[PDB]
Design a protein around this motif. Structure first.
Motif, PDB file in Angstrom:
ATOM      1  N   UNK A   1       0.769  -1.287   0.067  1.00  0.00           N
ATOM      2  CA  UNK A   1      -0.022  -0.090   0.023  1.00  0.00           C
ATOM      3  C   UNK A   1       0.845   1.385   0.029  1.00  0.00           C
TER       4      UNK A   1
ATOM      5  N   UNK B   1      10.583   0.579   0.541  1.00  0.00           N
ATOM      6  CA  UNK B   1      11.279  -0.163   1.928  1.00  0.00           C
ATOM      7  C   UNK B   1      10.671   0.602   3.289  1.00  0.00           C
TER       8      UNK B   1
ATOM      9  N   UNK C   1      11.067  -0.085   7.663  1.00  0.00           N
ATOM     10  CA  UNK C   1      11.892  -0.449   8.904  1.00  0.00           C
ATOM     11  C   UNK C   1      10.894  -1.102   9.955  1.00  0.00           C
TER      12      UNK C   1
ATOM     13  N   UNK D   1      10.105  -1.570  13.903  1.00  0.00           N
ATOM     14  CA  UNK D   1      10.280  -0.812  15.090  1.00  0.00           C
ATOM     15  C   UNK D   1      10.560  -1.706  15.944  1.00  0.00           C
TER      16      UNK D   1
ATOM     17  N   UNK E   1       7.506   1.091   9.989  1.00  0.00           N
ATOM     18  CA  UNK E   1       7.478   2.600   9.459  1.00  0.00           C
ATOM     19  C   UNK E   1       8.171   3.040   8.160  1.00  0.00           C
ATOM     20  N   UNK E   2       7.510   3.478   7.340  1.00  0.00           N
ATOM     21  CA  UNK E   2       8.103   4.247   5.922  1.00  0.00           C
ATOM     22  C   UNK E   2       7.331   5.466   5.627  1.00  0.00           C
ATOM     23  N   UNK E   3       8.248   6.724   5.555  1.00  0.00           N
ATOM     24  CA  UNK E   3       7.755   7.738   5.085  1.00  0.00           C
ATOM     25  C   UNK E   3       7.416   8.549   6.287  1.00  0.00           C
ATOM     26  N   UNK E   4       5.791   8.754   6.447  1.00  0.00           N
ATOM     27  CA  UNK E   4       4.930   9.277   7.392  1.00  0.00           C
ATOM     28  C   UNK E   4       4.141   8.689   8.098  1.00  0.00           C
ATOM     29  N   UNK E   5       4.070   7.452   7.882  1.00  0.00           N
ATOM     30  CA  UNK E   5       3.089   6.525   8.358  1.00  0.00           C
ATOM     31  C   UNK E   5       3.749   5.070   8.875  1.00  0.00           C
ATOM     32  N   UNK E   6       2.963   4.715   9.954  1.00  0.00           N
ATOM     33  CA  UNK E   6       3.511   3.445  10.351  1.00  0.00           C
ATOM     34  C   UNK E   6       2.151   2.447  10.636  1.00  0.00           C
TER      35      UNK E   6
END
Ligand SMILES: [Mg+2]
Ligand SMILES: [Mg+2]
Ligand SMILES: [Mg+2]
Ligand SMILES: [Mg+2]
Ligand SMILES: [Mg+2]
Ligand SMILES: [Mg+2]
Ligand SMILES: [Mg+2]
Ligand SMILES: [Mg+2]
Ligand SMILES: [Mg+2]
Ligand SMILES: [Mg+2]
Ligand SMILES: [Mg+2]
Ligand SMILES: [Mg+2]
Ligand SMILES: [Mg+2]
Ligand SMILES: [Mg+2]
Ligand SMILES: [Mg+2]
Ligand SMILES: [Mg+2]
Ligand SMILES: [Mg+2]
Ligand SMILES: [Mg+2]
Ligand SMILES: [Mg+2]
Ligand SMILES: [Mg+2]
Ligand SMILES: [Mg+2]
Ligand SMILES: [Mg+2]
Ligand SMILES: [Mg+2]
Ligand SMILES: [Mg+2]
Ligand SMILES: [Mg+2]
Ligand SMILES: [Mg+2]
Ligand SMILES: [Mg+2]
Ligand SMILES: [Mg+2]
Ligand SMILES: [Mg+2]
Ligand SMILES: [Mg+2]
Ligand SMILES: [Mg+2]
Ligand SMILES: [Mg+2]
Ligand SMILES: [Mg+2]
Ligand SMILES: [Mg+2]
Ligand SMILES: [Mg+2]
Ligand SMILES: [Mg+2]
Ligand SMILES: [Mg+2]
Ligand SMILES: [Mg+2]
Ligand SMILES: [Mg+2]
Ligand SMILES: [Mg+2]
Ligand SMILES: [Mg+2]
Ligand SMILES: [Mg+2]
Ligand SMILES: [Mg+2]
Ligand SMILES: [Mg+2]
Ligand SMILES: [Mg+2]
Ligand SMILES: [Mg+2]
Ligand SMILES: [Mg+2]
Ligand SMILES: [Mg+2]
Ligand SMILES: [Mg+2]
Ligand SMILES: [Mg+2]
Ligand SMILES: [Mg+2]
Ligand SMILES: [Mg+2]
Ligand SMILES: [Mg+2]
Ligand SMILES: [Mg+2]
Ligand SMILES: [Mg+2]
Ligand SMILES: [Mg+2]
Ligand SMILES: [Mg+2]
Ligand SMILES: [Mg+2]
Ligand SMILES: [Mg+2]
Ligand SMILES: [Mg+2]
Ligand SMILES: [Mg+2]
Ligand SMILES: [Mg+2]
Ligand SMILES: [Mg+2]
Ligand SMILES: [Mg+2]
Ligand SMILES: [Mg+2]
Ligand SMILES: [Mg+2]
Ligand SMILES: [Mg+2]
Ligand SMILES: [Mg+2]
Ligand SMILES: [Mg+2]
Lengths: 393, 46, 339, 122, 240
Positions: free
Chosen positions: E53, E64, E66, E68, E84-89
RNA sequence: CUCGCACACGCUUACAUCAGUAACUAAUAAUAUACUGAUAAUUAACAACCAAUAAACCAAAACAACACUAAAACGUUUAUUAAUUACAUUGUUAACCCAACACAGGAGUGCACCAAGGAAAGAUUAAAAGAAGUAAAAGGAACUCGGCAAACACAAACCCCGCCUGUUUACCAAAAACAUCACCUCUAGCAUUACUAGUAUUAGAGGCAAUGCCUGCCCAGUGACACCAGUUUAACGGCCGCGGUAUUCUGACCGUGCAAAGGUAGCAUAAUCACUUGUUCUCCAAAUAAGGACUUGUAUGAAUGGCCACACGAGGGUUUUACUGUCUCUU
RNA sequence: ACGAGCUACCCAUGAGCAGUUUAAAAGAACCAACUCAUCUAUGUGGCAAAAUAGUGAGAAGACUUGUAGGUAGAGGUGAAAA
RNA sequence: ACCAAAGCUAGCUCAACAUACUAAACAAAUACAAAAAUACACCAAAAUAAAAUAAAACAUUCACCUAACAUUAAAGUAUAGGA
């Protein structure tokens, strides 16, 4: 995909219109004339209601894009209760600062000097800890929301009791709940530290810089750590209604212009509600940088340039028993580029004032094995607190 | 053990179970109210 | 058992008389006789203190950029409470050089103060205990805005056996018509800190009047003479509760009546006006069983409420009264006897 | 069981049942939870000056009464508008279209004290 | 009366959301499932089963994330993971060997050469080797991971023909889907879930399992070791 | 002698002052919180009604330093709008509620075990019988279905049945019955109201009961899959008859016939039709009691589970001291 | 038609468990509050249409409990006692 | 001699006619937990009559059984019925 709305819980769709409404050139006979519903008559359709005179409380909320301050470009705002994922790293990247483990050597020698201590330092600090944790309230077990500000105020008063033989601490004042706003561009990102901190100390005299020219020059060769999967703006509020104006917490002509020490308190009774230590360091770094940037822009100007006179601010974050110390020296205002000179930040982390406090005596096998009082005591943390308080004088 | 005290008073339950609104919210309760009115009861509901 | 809850910050019309009746306290206008044997210590800088007070006023009124206040009423609690805190802090810091006890004193911010005592008897009017003698119990739950606690007691103002021609006012009426209402909960005697605190003596209290008891509110309510009655009632109740807490922390009670007068000072501040009071607890045997042959009375000295500033605007204090500042300086320079 | 003939007042329920006794409201609820009273919602008693009033709550016993002649719309119209209409018609300036000059109000939505909506209590 | 569902939350959030259990009762109020009720209070952690998504449509390529933390989820048997990627988890279903600080790749690209199948990575079924252990299998493209989710369970890719993938489910059934369906590689976490031993009758009540009824029922003809043949391949492709 | 004070829920004036009680209420009088009449009363600070819209927010409470599993109610800040101007409205009594009653019953919470609440006896006498208690010579279960009850005792053992904690016939049965961890069978490849915002290490319909050793043979019939064959018993269920031999008496054997196979291991006069108080030994001076062994139970027997074992049990039986009015034999 | 204010089971929202032994908050042990009701004796138009006295079992849990909501008879609910 | 006994009224019942049929009160409050002046909605629903009984049992059947055509006859006739 999998939608998160359940059909039985969403707003139900309006019932289908009566079949009379589908016949061209045919006016339906409805019950609008009798002002009540009756079966057998068609359902009247009404235009949206127009209360010709506007009412403040009973009007629909105006849309965000209708506000005069709405901007197309998104601003990333950091307020008091924003959490950073990679706390220290993200704060260093956003503020263009270099991390240092130890406290500045000036503060360290000010602490280590035995002539700057108060009369009965050990007894007074133990008394303050005991009063904050147990004595300040009539309850058996006081809560963190009560004993964090109390212990911070007790330590502040203990440090203020130094004025008799340091007649220079009267040039300061305390401020609570003032609005700080400092915005800057960081690699095509419009960041803005905006909100209010716990407490602030203002002073008449600027705090002298603590970084040496050799350290400032060596900061140039330092490369900020970059974390790829996570964007630097993670944890901040993405908004569109904002003001790009470096408005400090006070108006013009304030007799106590220079910030000295910010005080942040995690006075929450729930661990999830409290900040993690990493997030707390990030928050102190961001607010200290915002205050320093506001002071620098008020003093010199809005042009993005490397400051010939650095601006140094301090911060203390208290969990109730765990203390974190920050000394942040802002040297530059141009932050869009990542190649110039970076600011500095000495961060003392995980400073335990005391390991644990027993508010009631523990009895094991019909005998008291540990009495009432704080278990384990590190006076070095209060020494650092006093050094930070006395760094101005 | 000992019976006879099956009635534990509570105004909220009384009004939510035998109240005017409860009776009128259903077609059968309206019939109950109509029956009481026809008989001439002093109190149609609680 | 059931007890009245006396509120120092009360809306009752004539509450000072009722509080004096409950307390066995005589109210005397004017400050107590000063100990003129003081050495020429007050060489302090009136200009510096005035500058500090004006700086606090200007910071809390005009310089502070708070969050936007949608209501136009501009309530005087959120603008005077930080002013009171800053004023107390700055005054203590500046006067601690002249008065060494303020350096070691403890400043308490909005710490609760409690006192529970008995006063007289009453025949129970209703219930299965009708006709039986029951004592009248009172409790004061006070939250002073600022407190200063010191290790050693302040010197007494008058001798413990001080005799005053003015008698304690007696009310030929039930306490329920003040109005007061009985309540049953934990009856605590609290000084602002537990008994284990080494700073078991008090120096000065600061009490901020609320928005309900403002001068404009009273004038609208058509209570012109209540403006000083509210100050008197607040001072009497708060200072009596806090002195009694000190006495019972030391170990005195009704049957172990106090041997040394307990002295406290109080500063009651509105948004703009100041008033000063001095209280001396001489007797703690207020119960009926011990009041049969008790000639001692508590004494409360009062001062007319005088404004500090006058309608400031645009970071410039228009009118400034030095009398209030000197009164505050004298209260903060009062020191315990040295030995 | 509980009663049914007794009135269901605010004294007969739990703490959460606080029913009014019939007094009209005088305000709303403000921001911090207090009650904000609106001045315009409180009635203002329009009390005249009785200092120079030469009338008493009782009449003289020998004073004669009169035959009951309740005031009707016809009598009110004859008293207030009939002479003016007659005089204007004799003069020849009568205008049937315009009647607002004679006290007639075509629409009640303009004036303060309306008659059919009854904007005034008493 | 009729009850309303607790699942009225149109916004995806990372923090756990409180859930109202209902023991076997439907919305009407009558029991539909027996042996449910009286468990421990739980908070629902919303899981994004649509692994691929992209945060924004402007960059719909592979991305990609990461990891947590890998955490315990009371609402499922497997452990969840915060990525977490960008601004969302997002909460995803952790694989057998996910740990904090790991890197996961989410792709939708199919090439002539098979990709080295990592454990946390999620690739379309057409890009994985023929003998790959997968999980969180998706039936229709862009629908979501309804299939294999339980702890330790994993399916096995069998063969790819005519742009169409065939998998074997933990129930040993063959499932045929489009080769562009995204599926996570590797076994799901908590591979030792089947070896847990309930110590007492109280742990079942903690989990929320009411005791079985005491009525004795004579076995019918349904009982007994029914040796039934494997059901035919379940196909989801739409043949024109 | 000690269930008192207050709040919540509940009753609604039964609360307070004065006056009267011939009679009505108190299960009787005195008089009165409980009957009668008149007049008054509960005064808000405590409690009730007492913001929405988006965003940042994974990190438990248990003195919470830090952790376990069953994964856990309880929050601030930022931005946009929140009429703005004293005094709003409502609950404030009580000895009280639910049980037909002024009922030895049922009743949530916070405080202390008295500093607050009350009175077992209307007055006599000291018959029988009855209820409760105290004490008792010598004996110490000889009483009785049973050591039930009581006792200056309040200990140790052997079996049966259930593994264990727990649940059940409100009001004659608390159990050996049900559940139970564990082990097995079936049914399901899947989405917006249960199951489940779960996905075969999962979820439902059931059996038997932890654990240890095992769970033997049979698909002939009836079911269920298979839509007919064929497969399934940890599916319903079943697991021989006749002739002869042992002095009479064989379940053993030799033959024969019929079956789908013809009861395997184990235990065994059982909580197991009758015979039956089967036979023998120990226990007692004496035993249809209890335990051990034989056992052929022709009607035991293996997840409608068979065998042993720890721990457990207000379960059902049997012993040993100790104890006693249970009893000799009552006072 | 009316009934889940008693009771059977769930759903929300709260509340209780003091002392002693134990690295333990272990469906551990002793024993209070509290919850049940094993045995006996009174009571049997009784204090009571199921109680009193003594004696018992559990007492950090599959626990007790307040408030409010839901499931209604060709049914509900049921650790099956029809 | 106590306890006691006897009134003749309140009013009811059945029909005819009948305007043509949910009386009077409705100042305010009344389907918030009715009698609580005052805030952005949602509203509405229909799907056979059954049985007790008779047929000396009970299975097909069982007049009236809250649906208009009244009366004198045809007539308890034609028909329908485990006939
Ligand atoms: Mg009844
Ligand atoms: Mg009734
Ligand atoms: Mg009420
Ligand atoms: Mg109440
Ligand atoms: Mg108000
Ligand atoms: Mg679950
Ligand atoms: Mg789990
Ligand atoms: Mg089962
Ligand atoms: Mg069973
Ligand atoms: Mg009653
Ligand atoms: Mg009376
Ligand atoms: Mg009498
Ligand atoms: Mg009361
Ligand atoms: Mg007697
Ligand atoms: Mg006798
Ligand atoms: Mg006897
Ligand atoms: Mg005895
Ligand atoms: Mg004897
Ligand atoms: Mg015998
Ligand atoms: Mg015998
Ligand atoms: Mg016994
Ligand atoms: Mg013994
Ligand atoms: Mg014994
Ligand atoms: Mg058992
Ligand atoms: Mg065991
Ligand atoms: Mg048990
Ligand atoms: Mg049960
Ligand atoms: Mg029971
Ligand atoms: Mg029973
Ligand atoms: Mg039992
Ligand atoms: Mg029983
Ligand atoms: Mg069983
Ligand atoms: Mg096995
Ligand atoms: Mg069984
Ligand atoms: Mg077994
Ligand atoms: Mg078998
Ligand atoms: Mg077969
Ligand atoms: Mg076959
Ligand atoms: Mg059989
Ligand atoms: Mg023979
Ligand atoms: Mg044997
Ligand atoms: Mg037998
Ligand atoms: Mg015997
Ligand atoms: Mg035999
Ligand atoms: Mg058999
Ligand atoms: Mg058998
Ligand atoms: Mg079987
Ligand atoms: Mg036993
Ligand atoms: Mg038992
Ligand atoms: Mg004798
Ligand atoms: Mg209900
Ligand atoms: Mg209920
Ligand atoms: Mg305990
Ligand atoms: Mg236990
Ligand atoms: Mg009992
Ligand atoms: Mg006894
Ligand atoms: Mg007991
Ligand atoms: Mg016990
Ligand atoms: Mg036990
Ligand atoms: Mg039937
Ligand atoms: Mg049923
Ligand atoms: Mg049965
Ligand atoms: Mg039966
Ligand atoms: Mg018949
Ligand atoms: Mg007959
Ligand atoms: Mg019959
Ligand atoms: Mg019959
Ligand atoms: Mg019929
Ligand atoms: Mg025919």
């Amino acid at each position: 995909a999998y939608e998160w709305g359940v059909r039985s819980t969403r707003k139900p769709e309006p019932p289908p219109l009566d079949r009379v409404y589908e016949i061209p050139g045919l006016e339906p006979i409805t019950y609008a004339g009798k002002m009540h519903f009756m079966p057998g008559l068609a359902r009247p359709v009404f235009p949206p209601w127009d209360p010709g005179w506007t009412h403040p409380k009973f009007r629909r909320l105006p849309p965000l894009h209708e506000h005069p301050l709405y901007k197309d470009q998104a601003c990333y705002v950091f307020h008091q209760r924003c959490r950073l994922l990679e706390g220290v790293k993200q704060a260093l990247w956003l503020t263009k600062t270099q991390l240092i483990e130890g406290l500045p050597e000036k503060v360290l020698r000010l602490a280590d000097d035995p002539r700057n201590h108060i009369e009965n330092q050990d007894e007074r600090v133990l008394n303050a800890i005991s009063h904050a944790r147990l004595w300040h309230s009539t309850e058996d077990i006081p809560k963190r929301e009560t004993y964090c500000p109390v212990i911070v105020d007790s330590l502040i008063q203990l440090c203020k009791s130094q004025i008799l033989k340091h007649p220079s601490l009267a040039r300061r004042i305390c401020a609570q709940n003032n609005t700080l706003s400092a915005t800057w561009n960081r690699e095509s990102i419009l960041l803005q530290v905006h909100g209010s901190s716990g407490a602030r100390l203002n002073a008449k005299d600027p705090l002298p810089p603590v970084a040496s020219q050799e350290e400032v020059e060596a900061t140039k060769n330092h490369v900020l750590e970059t974390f790829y999967p996570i964007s630097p703006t993670m944890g901040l509020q993405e908004c569109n209604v904002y003001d790009v104006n470096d408005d400090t917490g006070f108006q013009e002509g304030y007799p106590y212009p220079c910030p000295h020490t910010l005080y942040f308190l995690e006075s929450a009774n729930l661990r999830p509600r409290r900040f993690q230590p990493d997030q707390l360091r990030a928050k102190m770094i961001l607010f200290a940088f915002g205050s320093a940037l506001a002071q620098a822009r008020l003093l010199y100007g809005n042009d993005s340039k490397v400051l010939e006179q650095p601006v140094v601010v301090q911060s203390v974050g208290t969990d109730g028993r765990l203390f974190q110390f920050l000394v942040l020296q802002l040297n530059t205002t141009d932050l869009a580029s990542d190649e110039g000179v970076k600011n500095l930040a000495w961060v003392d982390s995980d400073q335990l004032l005391y390991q644990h406090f027993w508010c009631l005596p523990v009895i094991k096998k019909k005998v008291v094995v540990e009495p009432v009082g704080p278990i384990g005591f590190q006076p070095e943390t209060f020494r650092k607190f006093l050094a930070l308080y006395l760094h101005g004088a | 053990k000992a019976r006879g005290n099956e009635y534990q008073p509570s105004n909220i339950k009384r009004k939510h179970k035998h109240g005017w609104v409860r009776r009128l919210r259903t077609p059968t309760g309206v019939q109950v109210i109509l029956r009481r009115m026809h008989k001439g009861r002093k109190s149609l509901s609680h | 058992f059931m007890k009245y809850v006396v509120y120092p910050q009360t809306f009752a019309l004539n509450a000072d008389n009722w509080y004096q009746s409950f307390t066995k306290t005589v109210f005397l206008s004017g400050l107590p006789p000063t100990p003129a044997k003081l050495e020429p210590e007050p060489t302090l800088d009136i200009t510096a203190l005035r500058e500090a007070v004006c700086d606090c006023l200007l910071q809390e009124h005009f310089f502070l950029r708070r969050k936007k206040r949608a209501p136009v009423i501009q309530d005087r609690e959120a603008i005077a409470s930080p002013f009171l805190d800053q004023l107390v802090a700055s005054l203590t810091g500046l006067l601690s050089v002249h008065n060494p006890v303020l350096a070691a004193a403890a400043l308490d911010c909005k710490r609760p103060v409690h006192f529970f005592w008995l006063r007289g008897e009453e025949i129970i009017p209703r219930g299965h205990r009708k006709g039986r003698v029951d004592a009248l119990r009172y409790q004061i739950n006070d939250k002073p805005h600022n407190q200063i606690r010191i290790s050693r007691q302040l010197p007494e103002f008058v001798p413990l056996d001080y005799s005053i021609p003015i008698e304690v006012p007696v009310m030929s009426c039930k306490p329920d018509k003040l109005p007061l209402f009985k309540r049953q909960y934990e009856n605590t005697i609290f000084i602002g800190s537990k008994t284990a605190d080494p700073l078991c003596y008090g120096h000065t209290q600061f009490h901020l009047l609320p928005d309900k008891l403002k001068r404009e509110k009273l004038l609208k309510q058509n209570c012109a003479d209540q403006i000083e009655v509210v100050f008197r009632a607040n001072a009497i109740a708060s200072l009596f509760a806090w002195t009694g807490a000190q006495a019972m922390y030391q170990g005195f009670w009704s049957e172990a009546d106090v041997t040394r007068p307990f002295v406290s000072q109080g500063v009651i501040t509105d948004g703009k006006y100041f008033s000063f009071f001095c209280y001396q607890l001489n007797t703690l045997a207020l119960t009926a069983q011990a009041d049969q042959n008790n000639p001692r009375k508590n004494i409360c000295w009062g001062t007319q409420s005088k404004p500090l500033y006058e309608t400031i605007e645009d970071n410039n204090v228009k009118g400034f009264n030095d009398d209030v500042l000197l009164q505050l300086v004298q209260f903060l320079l009062n020191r315990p006897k040295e030995d | 069981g509980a009663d049914r003939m007794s009135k269901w007042t605010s004294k007969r329920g739990p703490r959460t049942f606080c029913k009014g006794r019939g007094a009209k409201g005088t305000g709303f609820h403000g921001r911090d939870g207090k009650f904000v009273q609106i001045k315009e919602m409180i009635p203002e008693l329009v009390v005249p000056e009785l200092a120079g009033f030469k009338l008493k709550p009782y009449v003289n016993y020998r004073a004669p009464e009169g035959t009951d002649t309740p005031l009707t719309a016809k009598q009110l119209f004859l008293e207030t508008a009939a002479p003016a209409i007659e005089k204007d018609f004799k003069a020849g300036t009568f205008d049937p279209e315009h009647l607002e000059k004679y006290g007639f109000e075509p629409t009640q939505e303009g004036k303060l004290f309306q008659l059919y909506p009854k904007n005034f209590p008493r | 009366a009729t009850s309303v569902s607790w699942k009225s939350r149109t916004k995806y959030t990372v923090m756990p959301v409180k859930m109202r259990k209902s023991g076997g009762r439907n919305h009407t109020g009558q029991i539909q499932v027996h042996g449910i009720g009286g468990g421990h209070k739980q908070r629902y952690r919303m899981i994004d089963f649509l692994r691929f998504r992209p945060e924004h449509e402007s960059k719909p390529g592979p991305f990609e994330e990461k990891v947590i933390a890998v955490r315990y989820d009371p609402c499922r048997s497997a452990d969840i993971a915060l990525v977490a990627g960008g601004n969302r988890k997002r909460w995803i279903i952790a694989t057998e060997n996910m740990k904090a600080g790991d890197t996961v790749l989410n792709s939708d690209h199919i090439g002539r050469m098979a990709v080295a199948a990592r454990e946390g990575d999620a690739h379309p079924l057409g890009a994985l080797p023929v003998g790959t252990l997968i999980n969180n299998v998706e039936s229709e493209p862009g629908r979501g991971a309804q299939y294999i989710r339980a702890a330790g369970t994993c399916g096995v890719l069998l063969r790819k023909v005519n742009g169409t993938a065939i998998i074997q489910l933990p129930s040993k059934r063959q499932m045929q889907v489009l080769e562009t369906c995204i599926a996570t590689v590797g076994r799901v976490s908590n591979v030792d879930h089947n070896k847990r031993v309930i110590g007492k009758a109280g742990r079942n009540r903690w989990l929320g399992k009411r005791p079985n009824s005491g009525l004795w029922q004579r076995k019918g003809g349904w009982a007994g070791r029914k040796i039934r043949p494997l059901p035919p391949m379940k196909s989801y492709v739409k043949l024109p």
